Design a protein around this nucleic acid. Structure first.
Ligand SMILES: Nc1ncnc2c1ncn2[C@@H]1O[C@H](COP(=O)(O)OP(=O)(O)OP(=O)(O)O)[C@@H](O)[C@H]1O
Ligand SMILES: Nc1ncnc2c1ncn2[C@@H]1O[C@H](COP(=O)(O)OP(=O)(O)OP(=O)(O)O)[C@@H](O)[C@H]1O
Ligand SMILES: [Mg+2]
Ligand SMILES: [Mg+2]
Ligand SMILES: [Mn+2]
Ligand SMILES: [Mn+2]
Ligand SMILES: [Mn+2]
Ligand SMILES: [Mn+2]
Lengths: 476, 453, 459, 493
DNA sequence: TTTTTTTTTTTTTTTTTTTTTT
DNA sequence: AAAAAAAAAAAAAAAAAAAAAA
């Protein structure tokens, strides 16, 4: 892509890379880092002025050696260069990088040659932890290859300070809020807690950009960040923390700003949200005209096919057996293994590589089966389904989903009564049934400790009395 | 539904007898982290003592109280106090006082009067009962759960965690109380204590029988000899002192024999019939109890199976179930459509996981009116895979049981990896750390969530 | 000092009955790791069965054998082979054959003949014993330690790990065969078994005696009435059929009464005197036994005292001790482990946490496998770090490192460790002793397998 | 020190920094990275050309976020500068840095301003152990701040490629070997499996320096690597993994090279090895004369006082009590606390602070006491001492290590059948059963496995002695139990 | 001052498996 | 094959005792 206009700031937008996800997986173990290298190479040769990363660069709070080393390899082979960047920092960086003595952007440092400065915030996974409250982006900021911005020292009184750039005649204000707990963030936004210091000098030509890493919509009551608690002076919001990619911009009517949801680069969960095609976006800020955006799809995302079936919705399947359910499930997984291999081969033969058939990388396959009993049949046992870990172990070698190809889920006379029906049977030859069931009933319900001894002892004494008055009983 | 709010231990076990350590429970998760010997298990012991009124196992000599030989005093007084809201919404507080008065020779343990109060919205303190006998019955009745659920499922002891895989009689004894069928099991044990004494008596009667028979022999013979001597005298009258001697022997020694003996016989017969009837009813009144057990066990087995399916991260066992039919009462495991008794044929980690699954399945079928459950060191003998799967399953259970009124999971652990997969920081902003002070008593702190490692 | 070299399992528990998995035990450390349900504890079960010759607890359905209900074959046979070296440097091999027939719904378990060979330096295979009953006495003798040491201390089962903190009778039973004093306990059990029988006899005698008394109350009266009637007849001769009747009654019914009864009484007396004599010696053959339990367990308390101090990371307990004192009525013996919390003595059972009673058990086993296990330097720790916090895990690792260093300046010493947790592996400095670790896994057919892998492959 | 001669290559040698030891300790939690920062500052303004680390920069295999952050902050501040490095590379870097695409020294990189390169081998603590075998220094090499050299791929065959440097007219050959298990590198050296790639040109002009990180001496027979396996062309050896700082050059007479044992920057285990003054040394290689060393003490190392006593030597210490020895240990520890504080104050008021008084850092105190029983008394009970942690908790607020002030150590059939039962046998005193036949009735039982041996012995007595008493008609006329006992005792005598 | 009750601890019944005798 | 004791290990049950109800 040709060089931007001298008055055009071009930025690459990525988020939720989750480097270090499934590190030890024998097949999909390098998937996360390789995709990040592709993202950071789609910026080196796209001539972007800078890139912004909306959190979750690492999957874990304490990245491993291989995660950290493979993120420093791409940050050193793609950011270091000889062509100086054309962004002049108008503000004072010490108010934005107040954590340490490295209080200026990395590309102003005389000791480093930086051609593409990478700006990033923290996420809900690679957040501050330890005695010193050190983020994983603080260990990258020290290195000099990234500049972490938008920390929250105190989570109750938050003040967001922008970074003010300008390329010739186009200005840009880069507000950034890290990922804080949504219950506390809502409680802070509710009562004048979060404040933004919008620039006062020559206001009217800035492009106000914000990076957030909160929930867009929450399933609970008050555990998400409303898209209405932000300031109306913003012009675009880069929403992280959501892994579904949305290539378009959802213009927010009443606040006049467009929310961008870039999604994720790796699939950390096999759901319907992460089956959507992934993208990385390129903004183009130019004074006077609209900010045109170009989504460029990632070419390193492992092929993912998802189907969610219900066993009660398909006929000829009776819950009592298992040998006829696991024959239909196999035929349902085998058709979408072929569906994904065909897609992988077609996409590999749609970029100039159509003259060779290679060893296709295995896809990620998920079948979510609802093994619930139907409404009409009122029985405890539902459909019988094999062990998921062993059922999906018969597809090994054909699918990158080693142990989880299928996931089974379910869609959403107290004694005496039965004891009184037994009375007829129990036929004693001296004790009356009615006085004894009632001799114990009384014992049980009325809590009269001594009743079953006394009933027996009394009924004995009456039966002894009746037998003793018959002189014929004593001669036999 | 019911929910616990605060607990105030004092003088119990490791705690100080001149302090008041307080821990407040939050929703939907509570985290307790400490070292070895801190007092983490004592908190759950105090919760169970407040709710049901029974001490931890193997505490005969008053070892539940702070040791007098450590302190050196004589009159020690503990007091566990709990604040909770009932199932219907009423706010209540329960107090339990105990004493460990020590003499020169022996130490006497006695339980003082407790207190239960239903405090209204405007602090309308009105006591409900004082004596501990009714305090062991009002609190489980107000919470909504039976007394067995509170002590086997919710506040299960750490050293009695693996009760589902114990001897058949223990399982039957613990499912009798859960199913509220203990009344009839005590009626059977009282009908058995009518056959016991009875049997002894029968054993006596038999001896007597022998003797009586001898006496009965000694009377017919003398009456026949008297008649033979009388008819010989009548023959000599037509043509005495032996009769006089035999008549005096019959009048003194063999008088009331024909019917005294009659009544003895009658009694014996009565005993005989009393036997059969006690047994026969016992067999029929116990078949009904086991039928009720097996009938009320289907709903538990249906949610045991769905939990095992998504929690056990292994490829050997398909499902797991509890089945009744002394008392062939056991939990079986299925390995590709074959049933095998799990006990003596499993490992440590599989047994631990099975017990956790069984308790979690019983908590949501009988503790539907009390969303509380305490897991004391859940991740023992579990590998990395089962730790991760258990944490994910607990997260799913918390999510599912929160559109209900509440769910309070108390987690006690010092295994750091188990916290990560459950998102402890996403459910609470703090945790409680139990630690001994410089005088060896236990303290309960209030630590920020990010300060754990 | 003895040493074990290589074990081969076939057919036991989850292992396949048509294959064979082996494991070589290195010196001075062996590591076994795996998942849940792998077969890690089955290895220790088979080692204990190879050496002593007893099945794991609760295995009465023949459940120590690969169950035929899932394989579908009637006759199934297992085998366990251990290749150890004697205490006096002799390479031997033990084999143990087991059969489990399933003809009908009933399964029969049987122990076929094994063999103990003693290979010379020239491969002179010589089966010196074949009966399994002989093997259970030979193998512990060749290893150099008593059988009870290999059951409870060395190759202790996982579920029986916390045996030092069990009931006093269950504790004296374990320590009776460790101290080789079970013979006199068997004698005491015999002196108890005869007693009961004698008591029954006394009862019988008593009943008989009562009858005798009745007869002795009678007979003489007839003799007195006969004498009164005789002297009346003598008076009438100076001036019979009643005597004839009473004499016939005495001749038929009351004949041999005077001696009989007396001897019965004597017998009863004898029984009474046997009760006293059986009791007196018995309450003394126990006082001379428990005077030996507390005399032999004296250097055992010196090593628990210096292992506790250097391992327990806590401020409450100062030391622990095992006390074996006589006694209350219904407690048998006062055999328990006590703890000294600041020079005050408290019984550890019932007032100790789950981690303290684990550390005490491990320390007691380690101190036992230094005095009564000095001829066989093996110790199998199965999941040592259960309910142990960070500090105790670290200090236990350091203490095991110190034990390995100290006990290996002497002759052979081996330490099998079964675990799955990273902290213990990191703290123990595992890689400084071996270059590998065995990993138990289940293959695609649910059969356990043992694998030899690199040391630097445990992440 | 001032600017070195243009013909001099000046090196700052340090090792065993262990950045991360006691990371979470409230008091001594920052003593490792602070002293590493002091070392790098003593390198920045001593104008050293390069610093070589010889192992154990990190305490753990996976360094934490604080250790990595502090090390990166230290390296960034005092390794980068406008002044170009005057070292000239003569070898091909790819042969030495054979791991990645970063195959050149950091100071020759076109987009870095390294003014003082930091080299370094890996240690036995921060060694390569992972899925891809990455050590903590391979991360730092990726940042461009250090250059990790001397990395072994296969342990069986080892090739040691040196880094060849030249400044002015002085040439240097930096050899480096990582830390691999001593008892395997011993085997590799044994069967000629270690090779050194000497430079091809101008033999006899290079200063051959080698950074080894193995056990110098093996107290046990197999615990170390000897100095006889190292080649004779070396001119100096920098021995790591040894924490005892020896500030002199130990000359090897036959192999003709000097061994250096710098020691460590932090004391990782309280003992006498780490109770010697600790230094970081400076080498001054120049062609024409011998190199000149210059130790410079570290001034951020906590004051450590070590005393070791055996409890039995001191009289008036009776082992039975645990309070007359506690009162002695308490006063000994409090005596050597004031020595440590006096030394701390004397070293803090002798660098430019002779007029200002501040709170002295709490020293490290360690007393080793030997509670072994005296040789004269052989009782099982030795000296009784209290809990080591509760004894050391008495000095909180005056000692850095509040939990390990004191350490306690030791400086090292069936009782002949009825032997013990014999006493009881004679005192048994029964009134019907003979003692000798019964002790022998049980001996036989226990001794010669005659299962029913006891059983009959008693039942002969309920036969033989029945009749025998049935033969005395006087025994049957006496209802008094005391006369019966007297008669039986008289028939026995 | 005396009686029920629950908990531990120890002691027993059953049932296989060897071992004997063949 | 066939049987008839011994040994031993689990599972269930019976004393002892201190607390609680009377
Ligand atoms: N009656 C008592 N008097 C005094 N101290 C006691 C008493 N009972 C127990 N203790 C001590 O108090 C501690 C009991 O606490 P607890 O058993 O709850 O610890 P824990 O947190 O469960 O430890 P773990 O992590 O090992 O489970 C033990 O250290 C024990 O020695
Ligand atoms: N008799 C048997 N027949 C067939 N399979 C069995 C038998 N007994 C046990 N198994 C299976 O083999 C496994 C072996 O158990 P093992 O004791 O080896 O587990 P483990 O290695 O100890 O792991 P953990 O201690 O973590 O559970 C058992 O858990 C069970 O799943
Ligand atoms: Mg506990
Ligand atoms: Mg196991
Ligand atoms: Mn994310
Ligand atoms: Mn996120
Ligand atoms: Mn080292
Ligand atoms: Mn070191």
């Amino acid at each position: 892509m040709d060089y931007p206009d001298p008055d055009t700031i071009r930025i690459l937008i990525t988020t939720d890379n989750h480097v270090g996800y499934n590190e030890n997986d024998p097949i999909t173990g390098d998937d996360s880092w390789k995709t990040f290298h592709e993202v950071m190479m789609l910026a080196k040769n796209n001539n972007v002025d800078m890139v912004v990363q909306s959190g979750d660069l690492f999957h874990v709070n304490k990245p491993s050696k291989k995660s950290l080393y493979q993120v420093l390899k791409t940050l050193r082979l793609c950011c270091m260069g000889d062509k100086p960047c054309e962004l002049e920092l108008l503000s004072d960086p010490s108010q934005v990088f107040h954590y340490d003595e490295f209080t200026n952007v990395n590309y102003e440092d005389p000791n480093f040659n930086i051609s593409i400065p990478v700006f990033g915030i923290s996420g809900n996974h690679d957040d501050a932890s330890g005695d010193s409250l050190l983020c994983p982006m603080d260990i990258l900021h020290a290195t000099g290859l990234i500049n972490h911005f938008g920390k929250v020292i105190e989570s109750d009184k938050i003040k967001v300070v922008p970074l003010l750039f300008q390329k010739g005649s186009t200005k840009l204000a880069l507000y950034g809020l890290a990922a804080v707990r949504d219950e506390r963030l809502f409680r802070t936004f509710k009562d004048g807690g979060v404040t933004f210091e919008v620039p006062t000098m020559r206001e009217g030509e800035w492009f106000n950009l914000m990076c957030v890493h909160q929930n867009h919509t929450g399933h609970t009551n008050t555990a998400f960040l409303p898209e209405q608690f932000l300031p109306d002076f913003l012009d675009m919001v880069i929403w992280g923390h959501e892994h579904e990619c949305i290539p378009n911009l959802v213009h927010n009517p009443i606040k006049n700003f467009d929310v961008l949801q870039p999604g994720s680069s790796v699939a950390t969960s096999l759901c319907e949200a992460e089956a959507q095609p992934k993208y990385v976006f390129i903004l183009d800020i130019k004074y006077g005209e609209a900010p045109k955006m170009t989504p460029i799809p990632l070419e390193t995302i492992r092929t993912f096919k998802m189907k969610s079936i219900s066993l009660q919705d398909v006929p000829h399947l009776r819950p009592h057996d298992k040998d006829a359910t696991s024959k239909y499930l196999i035929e349902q997984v085998e058709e979408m293994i072929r569906d994904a291999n065909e897609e992988t081969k077609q996409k590999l033969a749609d970029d100039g590589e159509g003259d060779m058939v290679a060893e296709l990388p295995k896809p990620l396959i998920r079948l979510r089966v609802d093994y619930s009993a139907p409404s009409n049949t009122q029985s405890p046992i539902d459909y019988q389904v094999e062990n998921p870990r062993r059922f999906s172990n018969r597809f090994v070698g054909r699918v990158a989903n080693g142990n989880n190809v299928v996931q089974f889920y379910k869609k959403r006379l107290e004694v005496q009564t039965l004891v009184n029906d037994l009375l007829n049977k129990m036929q004693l030859s001296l004790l009356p049934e009615v006085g004894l069931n009632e001799a114990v009933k009384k014992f049980v319900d009325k809590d009269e400790k001594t009743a079953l001894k006394e009933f027996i002892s009394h009924e004995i004494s009456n039966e002894v009395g009746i037998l003793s008055t018959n002189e014929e009983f004593l001669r036999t | 539904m019911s929910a616990i709010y605060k607990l105030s231990i004092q003088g119990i076990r490791s705690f100080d007898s001149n302090d008041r350590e307080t821990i407040e429970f939050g929703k939907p998760l509570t985290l307790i982290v400490g070292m070895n010997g801190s007092g983490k298990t004592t908190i759950i012991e105090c919760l169970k003592y407040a709710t049901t009124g029974d001490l931890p196992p193997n505490s005969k000599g008053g070892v539940f109280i702070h040791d007098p030989k450590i302190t050196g005093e004589k009159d020690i007084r503990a007091q566990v106090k709990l604040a909770f809201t009932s199932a219907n919404g009423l706010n209540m507080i329960v107090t339990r006082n105990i004493q460990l008065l020590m003499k020169k020779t022996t130490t006497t343990f006695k339980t003082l009067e407790g207190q239960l109060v239903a405090i209204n919205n405007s602090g309308d303190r009105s006591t409900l009962s004082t004596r501990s006998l009714e305090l062991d019955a009002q609190v489980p009745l107000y919470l909504g759960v039976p007394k067995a659920i509170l002590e086997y499922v919710i506040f299960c002891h750490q050293e009695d965690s693996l009760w589902p895989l114990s001897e058949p009689s223990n399982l039957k004894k613990k499912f009798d109380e859960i199913f509220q069928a203990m009344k009839f099991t005590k009626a059977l044990d009282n009908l058995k204590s009518i056959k016991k004494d009875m049997s002894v008596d029968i054993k006596l009667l038999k001896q007597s029988v022998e003797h009586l028979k001898l006496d009965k022999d000694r009377s017919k013979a003398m009456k026949l000899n008297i008649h033979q001597l009388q008819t010989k005298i009548d023959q000599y009258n037509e043509e005495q002192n032996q009769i006089d001697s035999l008549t005096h022997q019959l009048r003194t020694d063999y008088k009331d024999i024909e019917k005294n003996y009659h009544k003895e016989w009658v009694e014996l017969q009565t005993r005989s019939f009393v036997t059969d009837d006690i047994d026969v009813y016992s067999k029929a009144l116990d078949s009904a109890i086991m039928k009720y057990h097996g009938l009320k066990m289907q709903d538990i087995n249906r949610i045991i199976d769905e939990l095992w399916k998504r929690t056990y991260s292994g490829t050997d066992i398909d499902t797991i179930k509890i089945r009744s039919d002394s008392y062939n009462y056991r939990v079986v495991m299925y390995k590709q459509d074959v049933e095998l008794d799990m006990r003596g044929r499993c490992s440590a980690g599989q047994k631990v996981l099975a017990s956790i699954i069984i308790r979690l399945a019983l908590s949501e079928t009988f503790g539907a009116n009390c969303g509380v459950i305490a897991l004391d060191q859940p991740t023992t003998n579990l590998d990395e895979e089962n730790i991760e799967s258990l944490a994910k399953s607990l997260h799913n259970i918390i999510n599912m049981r929160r559109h209900q009124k509440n769910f309070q999971l108390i987690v006690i652990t010092h295994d750091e990896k188990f916290l990560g997969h459950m998102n402890a920081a996403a459910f609470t902003d703090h945790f409680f750390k139990v630690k001994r002070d410089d005088r060896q008593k236990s303290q309960i702190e209030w630590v920020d969530i990010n300060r754990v490692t």
